[PDB]
Symmetry: C3
Subunit: 205 residues, 3 copies
């Protein structure tokens, strides 16, 4: 099949087109597989987003999530974004299941992060709404763990968001693990952190 | 082509790879076809969800939907979920276009279902918000059909949601079909059911 | 290969099946590529939708967007829909970066469009909520450009939406370009238009 190999039998090239087309759809299905994946989160963050300044966050797998904090597989966790109004300050909270800073290894870390809103430019600065971060008690009628605080105008943690998330400024030694793990708070391998940024004293239309 | 069949001509195996790859993308496109499908609903339930305790539901195809009730192709219809607040009690309503129970075949059935919220554990029980379920009148200025009621603490229809939807506890003989079909209420093969779970008398932050 | 061509060698038909299957997935991936695309917008319009009657719209690329107005590549821009309530009047605004009508080529055009709501039939007509359309000032502490107005019951621009968007009835000569371009308002190739449809004087449950 000398002067007839590529002649009679050049199907070996036709097979080259099938494969290429196959390689094309392989990438698309994949890109599409990833695209689809970001939709859930996008729905997920939206289904759980609040626009009244208040926020209730949920953390499942505290154990499988706590064990990763200790083994440094994921030092912190962020909450779904939330707002003070439909077009107001954008925010969220940051946590460390196995503490950090002065409360590291012996506490729960909970910070308040002033994210970069899409509507920044029409709002007042520096941010100045009082805050209240708490640990929710899921007991018969016990009490939750809270601690409010007012931003430091001086702090560059409360200014018009240049980069993505502002600088996390909460509490290093919020609550001792030996207290949260030894109590209701943890129920069914999960807990809930609350956040109450005042918006009332800022007439909401 | 004895000792040369699978030798010279084993393309019949190469064709086995193209097909398999083809069978792989066939499943993905399909799974992806179904995934995409659930997004609409997910958007649809969200685009129509209310967080102020009130709810306006819409039912199109009353006829093609009523005829299936009679021919037992779909005895009831559920509404989009709704809430009393951003992180409050989750709910929704249930209907029977061709009645059920004592109003079966001669009435419209409308129930109030206390679904299992994602935020159950931080809320008060048993549920105790008064309710008002009504049939909206689309007439020049006529009146709608309503009937409020207060949960029975005794009832296991108003407790912290173990399974998915709580136990449907509304009204079997809400309105007679011969009254809804013989009146404005039905306009352009559709109707709207309203629901007013009190939330006011529960200071909403 | 006379009476054996299609006989021994009819792989040329087998290759016809691979391709067809390939052509099938080609269309699906594409349809799916477009479907995925509409989700973003659907999320995008939702992430930015307001249900309190107020609205803050954002227009990026004013220049690349203004230059198209002059070269007639896109005479106007529409905002994300918005409402007065969860099930209230649906609306939005219309703009012309290079004016239109009496303010054409020398002004910014901003109209108020009463869209066709999904919940039209249960609401009061003709629409009668005062309106306030303004141009937001992104300056150190300057002022924005506003101008309220009350619908004309006479106008067929404020009635129960037959077709899609009602008839755009705003202001042709809202603000002179030479004033908006020569001032803060434009910052980082973008601007923001505001809209304040009264809803307060319509007890919102």
């Amino acid at each position: 099949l000398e002067s007839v190999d590529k002649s009679a039998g050049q199907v070996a090239r036709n097979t080259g087109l099938l494969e290429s087309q196959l390689s094309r759809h392989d990438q698309m299905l994949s890109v599409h597989d990833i695209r689809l994946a970001d939709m859930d989160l996008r729905f997920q963050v939206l289904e759980t987003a609040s626009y009244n300044g208040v926020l209730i966050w949920k953390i499942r797998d505290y154990k499988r999530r706590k064990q990763e904090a200790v083994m440094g597989k994921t030092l912190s966790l962020y909450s779904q974004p939330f707002y003070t109004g439909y077009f107001g300050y954008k925010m969220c909270a940051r946590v460390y299941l196995n503490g950090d800073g002065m409360g590291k290894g012996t506490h729960l870390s909970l910070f308040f992060v002033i994210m970069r809103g899409e509507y920044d430019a029409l709002l007042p600065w520096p941010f100045k709404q009082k805050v209240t971060l708490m640990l929710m008690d899921q007991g018969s009628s016990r009490r939750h763990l809270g601690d409010a605080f007012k931003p430091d105008p001086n702090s560059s943690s409360f200014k018009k968001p240049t980069g993505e998330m502002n600088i996390a400024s909460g509490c290093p030694v919020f609550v001792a693990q030996t207290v949260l793990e030894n109590g209701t708070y943890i129920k069914d391998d999960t807990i809930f952190i609350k956040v109450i940024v005042d918006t009332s004293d800022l007439p909401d239309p």
